[PDB]
């Protein structure tokens, strides 16, 4: 196998799709590349080093709306960005468990700094723009995770019966797209009121 | 050790606190109870059977505001309920990874049916009350998970520096409590407008 960073991430996403994250061992990655474990360890010191790099890499390969277009509102950027993120995260089995607990990589600094400067520049203070970006990030994570884990880890009172039917009727994209509009409108109400009691 | 359902869940939460979920093996549970694996298997057929039961059990032991008080608004019930849920989930290491992908247990049917009937009874249709309850559930899950995984998996442009400082300054309860008010206000705006374009 060729063994630079790029060929290791590829084999490691490929493997994450067959085994998920808890089956993603440096031993199955060595066996997948057809090499021996001291070879692998020359390159990949460990699983955290690896999970972190994969976190960076799924976004960089599949998360396109990371930057606001010229003339775009903060509400359209937060919508277009969340959807794009939900979808980078669903491209790979356990894509959202991989992201959990990370923090921006140095390779992403210019992108996420632009994002926080665009919010201040639209009237958010740093703390509130930060909180808006986090609630969007945390709601897309918990939504994709409840979807990915339910698919995989496979007498009703009348309403629960009907709700389960609705829940299951699609991938959870409708429930997501609708909670995203409520999140975005609640932030508008906050932004606009500020010192007026609301 | 005594080996009924109740003593198994106890030993299994105890063990989840030392090892987390990926260290929660039926072998370390057998060793923790001081018994042999065929003994254990008479009781606990497997890890899913076990994770599912723990999911039920943390809520039943630590999630108190599962039911609306008499005369409470749907906005105060959604607030009081989300906070209570965030906290059942944080009581145990990897408490929120345990919950992921589950669905209500038969032992919870009366509680979650009441919850969906209270929303319809406050003007939500079943589909929208469902979506409101889910967005609250998915935002508390992704928030607790990003917190629990970051604590555990342990050149800045100016704004990111300051945001990281803010992010870390508390457990993430302030960011959570604030995204929860934006979620709840966006649903009010939806509820009230209905057929009026909004
Ligand atoms: C909201 N949207 C999905 C985000 C985004 O699209 C990012 C991106 N690279 O495109 C993030 O990395 C993004 O997805 C993301 O994960 C972000 C973060 O994790 C954090 C953390 O943990 C702490 C401080 C600041 C941030 C952040 C502002 O960079 C976050 C931006 C998140
Ligand atoms: C929003 N609040 C945190 C909830 C709640 O407090 C529950 C509870 N037992 O107290 C749930 O089980 C609750 O936490 C929860 O997990 C619920 C569900 O998972 C679902 C699922 O997956 C599908 C259909 C219906 C539901 C639900 C209506 O029962 C959910 C209610 C969630
Ligand atoms: Mg992140
Ligand atoms: Mg649930």
UniProtKB/Swiss-Prot annotation, chains A, B:
Superkingdom per UniProt: Bacteria
Role noted for this protein: TetR is the repressor of the tetracycline resistance element; its N-terminal region forms a helix-turn-helix structure and binds DNA. Binding of tetracycline to TetR reduces the repressor affinity for the tetracycline resistance gene (tetA) promoter operator sites.
Induction: By the [Mg-tetracycline]+ complex.
DNA-binding region(s), residue ranges: 25-44
Subunit structure and binding partners: Homodimer.
One Pfam family per UniProt: TetR_N
Keywords: Antibiotic resistance, DNA-binding, Magnesium, Metal-binding, Plasmid, Repressor, Transcription, Transcription regulation
Domain HTH tetR-type: 2-62
GO molecular-function terms, A-Z: DNA-binding transcription factor activity; metal ion binding; transcription cis-regulatory region binding
Sequence positions that bind tetracycline: 63, 81
A biological-process GO annotation: negative regulation of DNA-templated transcription
Record-listed Mg(2+) binding positions: 99
Protein's name in the database: Tetracycline repressor protein class D
Keyword Repressor assigned: yes
Source species of the chain: Escherichia coli
């Amino acid at each position: 196998a060729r063994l630079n960073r790029e060929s290791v991430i590829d084999a490691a996403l490929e493997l994450l799709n067959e085994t998920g994250i808890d089956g993603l061992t440096t031993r199955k990655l060595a066996q997948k590349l057809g090499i021996e474990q001291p070879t692998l360890y020359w390159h990949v010191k460990n699983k955290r080093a690896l999970l972190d790099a994969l976190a960076v890499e799924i976004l960089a390969r599949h998360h396109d709306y990371s930057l606001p277009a010229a003339g775009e509102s903060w509400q359209s950027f937060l919508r277009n960005n969340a959807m794009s993120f939900r979808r980078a995260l669903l491209r790979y089995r356990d894509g959202a468990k991989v992201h959990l607990g990370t923090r921006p990589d140095e390779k992403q600094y210019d992108t996420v700094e632009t994002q926080l400067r665009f919010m201040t520049e639209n009237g958010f203070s740093l703390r509130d723009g930060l909180y808006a970006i986090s609630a969007v990030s945390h709601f897309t994570l918990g939504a994709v995770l409840e979807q990915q884990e339910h698919t995989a880890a496979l007498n009703l009172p009348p309403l629960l019966r009907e709700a389960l039917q609705i829940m299951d009727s699609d991938d959870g994209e409708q429930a997501f797209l609708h909670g995203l509009e409520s999140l975005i409108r609640g932030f508008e109400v906050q932004l606009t009121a500020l010192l007026q009691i609301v």
